[PDB]
């Protein structure tokens, strides 16, 4: 790997520089190199890993959506045939996106999840696993769509089970997991009632736990609670 000759601490330092410069591809490459040193990640390092890949795939998803929209318009009644280029370029972006998802899932499977025993690491990585299968599901249309959806659900469910046993309701990782699993239900799994139920139960239980939330996690958790409320407002 191209990062094999760089010190772990230098990779972490450069991932932080890349974040400041909004160079998310570089950030992800640095964090992949750090993971490949074979040591567990600290809490701050997990956050750098997640932010890097979330931003890379986020841009790919935005571009894929633009191109898929064009492609669907091109396949409507009365649209002029303009050849294979829209499909080809959508496929190009899609394959790149799938490659990034596969890279993240490979890091999680070797060997971040196996070695994560504390709830704050295990839930975090399982959430990421669900998220990256969800992004694969967004673009999947072949015979593997159902398996991809099942893999996302299984990861989210294991994370949910651990989070309810081991974390308080206002823990930001627990809240963010529930936010995203609720979106999975609504947008991926054709289960809007489950999505709404999860968002509402999560929000209500977090409210009753606010009297215990730390001032340090308050911004993160209240933001995620607001996102739960935003989704509920969109869905009801």
């Amino acid at each position: 790997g191209a990062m094999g000759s760089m010190e772990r601490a230098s990779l972490i330092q450069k991932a932080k520089l890349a974040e400041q410069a909004e160079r998310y591809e570089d950030m992800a490459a640095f964090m992949k190199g750090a993971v490949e040193k074979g040591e567990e990640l600290s809490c701050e390092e997990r956050n750098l890993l997640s932010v890097a890949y979330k931003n890379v795939v986020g841009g790919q998803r935005a571009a894929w959506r633009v191109l898929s929209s064009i492609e669907q318009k091109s396949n409507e009644e009365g649209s002029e045939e303009k050849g294979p280029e829209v499909r080809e370029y959508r496929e190009k972006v899609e394959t790149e996106l799938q490659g990034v998802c596969d890279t993240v899932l490979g890091l999680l499977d070797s060997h971040l999840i196996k070695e994560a025993g504390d709830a704050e690491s295990r839930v975090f990585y399982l959430k990421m696993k669900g998220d990256y299968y969800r992004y694969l599901a967004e673009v999947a249309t072949g015979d593997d769509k159902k398996r991809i959806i099942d893999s996302a659900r299984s990861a989210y469910q294991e994370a949910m089970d651990i989070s309810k046993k081991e974390m308080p309701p206002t823990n930001p990782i627990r809240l963010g997991l529930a936010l995203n699993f609720s979106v999975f239900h609504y947008e991926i799994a054709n289960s809007p009632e489950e999505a709404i139920s999860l968002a509402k139960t999560t929000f209500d239980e977090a409210m009753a736990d606010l009297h215990t939330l730390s001032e340090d996690s308050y911004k993160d958790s209240t933001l995620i609670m607001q996102l739960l409320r935003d989704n509920l407002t969109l869905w009801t």
């Binding site: 998220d131 995203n180 979106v183």
Partner: peptide
């Protein structure tokens, strides 16, 4: 689209 984190 709905919000995720």
């Amino acid at each position: 689209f709905p919000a995720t984190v």
